[PDB]
């Protein structure tokens, strides 16, 4: 009762390698692979959500910074080169 069963469709190539891993004794069952893979996916998903939150934070900073203006890249080059000291 500490598991929840679900029917899932993987690609034939994926199912093949999952069977290979079990037959090699790397895992006892395909479910063990899916549990490990989904835990990793949870962490990956959180890193992706971090990215979205970071982009939103950066966006919000830009929108709060004042009146937007055109940029002259020739002028900008000179300003940046001066910041280089």
């Amino acid at each position: 009762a500490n598991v929840e069963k679900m029917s899932v469709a993987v690609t034939p190539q994926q199912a093949a390698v999952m069977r290979e891993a079990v037959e090699a004794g790397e895992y006892a069952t395909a479910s063990e692979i899916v549990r490990e893979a989904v835990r990793d996916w949870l962490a990956k998903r959180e890193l992706r959500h971090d990215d979205i939150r970071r982009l939103r934070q950066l966006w919000d900073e830009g929108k709060a910074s004042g009146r937007p203006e055109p940029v002259d890249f020739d002028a900008l080059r000179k300003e940046a080169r001066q910041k280089l000291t």
Partner: protein, 103 residues
């Protein structure tokens, strides 16, 4: 034909930061990034809806890639068709510095 294109104060700061960071050791590379970013912005002024919508960031946000940078911008009005009065580039983000899943 080209719409008005403006940059947030923070986006201007992003551009200066980018140039100074790489220019501190390779000024030719700094110049090339400015050549590329200016070219991409000029394209955008001509075709204001070329960036993909990213409403998961904020509702009007659009993203245009100029590797390794991501330009975040919006059009005003925020419409899918019809006249655009300006494009505002809100940030220039270096994916190597700020993103997990890209660059």
């Amino acid at each position: 034909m080209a719409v008005r294109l403006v940059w947030s104060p923070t986006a201007k700061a992003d551009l200066i930061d980018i140039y100074v960071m790489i220019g501190s050791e390779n000024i030719r590379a700094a110049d090339r990034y400015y050549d590329q970013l200016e070219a991409r912005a000029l394209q955008l002024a001509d075709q204001p809806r070329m960036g993909v919508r990213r409403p998961d960031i904020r509702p009007s946000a659009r993203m245009l890639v100029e590797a390794p940078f991501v330009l975040l911008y919006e059009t005003v009005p925020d419409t899918d068709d019809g006249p655009v009065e300006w494009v505002e580039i809100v940030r220039v983000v270096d994916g190597r510095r700020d993103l997990n899943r890209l660059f």
